Amino acid sequence: DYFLNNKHVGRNVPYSGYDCDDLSVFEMDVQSLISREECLCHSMIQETLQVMEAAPGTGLPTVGL
Amino acid sequence: IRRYTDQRSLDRSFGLVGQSFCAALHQELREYYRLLSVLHSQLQLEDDQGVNLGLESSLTLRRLLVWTYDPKIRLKTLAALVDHCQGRKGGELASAVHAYTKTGDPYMRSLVQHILSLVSH
Amino acid sequence: MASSSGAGAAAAAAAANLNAVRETMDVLLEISRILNTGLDMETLSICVRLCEQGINPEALSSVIKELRKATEALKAAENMTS
Amino acid sequence: MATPDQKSPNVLLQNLCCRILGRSEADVAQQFQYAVRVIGSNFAPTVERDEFLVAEKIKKELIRQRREADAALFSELHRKLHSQGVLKNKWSILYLLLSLSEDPRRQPSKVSSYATLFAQALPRDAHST
Amino acid sequence: AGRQSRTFLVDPNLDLSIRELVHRILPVAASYSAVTRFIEEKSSFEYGQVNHALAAAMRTLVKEHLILVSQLEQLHRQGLLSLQKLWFYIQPAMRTMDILASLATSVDKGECLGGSTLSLLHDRSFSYTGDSQ
Incomplete structure (x- = not known):
């Protein structure tokens, strides 16, 4: 939420250091999100190729038809 | 900032209020240097570990810029304050x-409020 | 006949470890007594298990202090209600 | 016949609360909840796992209490503890004991001043936990 | 040139299709540069506390954008980033930056300040009634 990560957007901002521990956590979260999108892409690719990769005449839903 | 701090730390004529302001500035500088040291330690860990760990500690130009974006604003605020208090x-x-x-x-409001209250005490 | 020697030695090692843990806990209790910490054997053992279980030492110390304050408040409330 | 095994924090906290308050867990639910809330978000990356600092602090406290002999005894006990390989987080155990230590002088019935010094310890925060 | 959006020069020896893809992507970077310029300009105390707060919020969103860019840089360091994946990943980022840049440009053109800025914010919020994000 735009307001949730708005640490420096506030009326009564407590005096804090420059400690970016939350920033590192947010960076890790964004990296996880990107990695999740990439992993989803790779899994979808693998599934689609694997469907396309079945042996000729194998994997057909109408077995024997 | 460091030149200003050194210039004013030596001036006994700055008086107790000036000394308190310099002390507050030194404390904030210590916090800034601590943050910089932590970031430096993370970059050094990334260099020493030899692994291209895509961790936030890996020395990217972008990672450095990201970690220093807020520090850049902080330092700009501090420098402007120093200039204004000259x-x-x-x-x-x-x-x-x-x-x-x-x-x-x-x-900036929070930082200046903390500094103002501490120097005014 | 071969197999029984291993289980007996393992059991003896476990018993020795238990005795060593007991000795260590006794030493800790003595240290607390000299330091007048006020912890009992069951509480000390629980704390030892918690620290052994990975509790953060700053967190563990703060939690212990808060728990001690809460226990003292509860004992004071029990003495005030009695 | 109990073998040491990692039990959930809830069980340990429940037993601890029961023994500290001397009441059933139902009678300490509010306190249990408060303690659980505070404890549940507390990891110490800033604590330096160094027994030497804790030992030095204990020695200084004993000297403050005019208990140099007790300090020597504590040192011997720490030496014996180091001889035993039962504890792995000795720094944590020592910190906990020192924090929960209550001064018998506070021998006497009070302690002279509390001019805490900058001496203290390390912040360990420097590492990327 | 002046208060114009940043323009880019592409090497003439680049692939025409590559050049067109670059020209399609470049709008996001132009929006970023304009936003940074706006943030730096309206961040002066003379622009008032409301403009300062606006700049701070923009700074937070710019930080998020920079985080995204840094993650993309990390993926590139792995050699795992293709142009189509880049375009796909930036499309939401492109739209977000374009919305932010349009709001910035509208505020700057209107020189909105204080209550006029709040009115402009209300009008923009109604203007973004169709974009839930």
């Missing part, structure tokens, strides 16, 4: 600090 002392120094307290930036 030549002011005593009640004039207090007035200069109060004038800088009127900033709209909540992070």
Whole structure:
């Protein structure tokens, strides 16, 4: 939420250091999100190729038809 | 900033209020240097570990820029405050600090409020 | 006949470890007594298990202090209600 | 016949609360909840796992209590503890004991002043936990 | 040139299709540069506390954008980033930056300040009634 990560957007901002521990956590979260999108892409690719990769005449839903 | 701090730390004529302001500046500088040291330690860990760990500690130009974006704003605020307080002392120094307290930036506002309260105590 | 020697030695090692843990806990209790910490054997053992279980030492110390304050408040409330 | 095994924090906290308050867990639910809330978000990356600092602090406290002999005894106990390989987080155990230590002088019935010094310890925060 | 959006020069020896893809992507970077310029300009105390707060919020969103860019840089360091994946990943980022840049440009053109800025914010919020994000 735009307001949730708005640490420096506030009326009564407590005096804090420059400690970016939350920033590192947010960076890790964004990296996880990107990695999740990439992993989803790779899994979808693998599934689609694997469907396309079945042996000729194998994997057909109408077995024997 | 460091030149200013060294210039004013030696001036006994800055008086108790000036000394308190310099002390507060030194404390904030210590916090900034601690943050810089932590970031440096993370970059050094990334260099020493030899692994291209895509961790936030890996020395990217972008990772450095990201970690210093807020530090850049902080340092800009501190430098502007130092410039604005140049030549002011005593009640004039207090007035200069109060004038800088009127900033709209909540992070700058918080920092300046803490510094103002500490120096005014 | 071969297999029984291993289980007996393992059991003896476990018993020795238990005795060593007991000795260590006794030493800790003595240290607390000299330091007048006020912890009992069951509480000390629980704390030892918690620290052994990975509790953060700053967190563990703060939690212990808070728990001690809460226990003292509860004992004071029990003495005030009695 | 109990073998040491990692039990959930809830069980340990429940037993601890029961023994500290001397009441059933139902009678300490509010306190249990408060303690659980505070404890549940507390990891110490800033604590330096160094027994030497804790030992030095204990020695200084004993000296403050005019208990140099007790300090020597504590040192011997720490030496014996180091001889035993039962504890792995000795720094944590020592910190906990020192924090929960209550001064018998506070011998006497009070302690002279509390001019805490900058001496303290390390912040360990420097590492990327 | 002046208060114009940043323009880019592409090497003439680049692939025409590559050049067109670059020209399609470049709008996001132009928006970023304009936003940074706006943030730096309206961040002066003379622009008032409301403009300062606006700049701070913009700074937070710019930080998020920079985080995204840094993650993309990390993926590139792995050699795992293709142009189509880049375009796909930036499309939401492109739209977000374009919305932010349009709001910035509207505020700057209107020189909105204080209550006029709040009115402009209300009008923009109604203007973004169709974009839930």
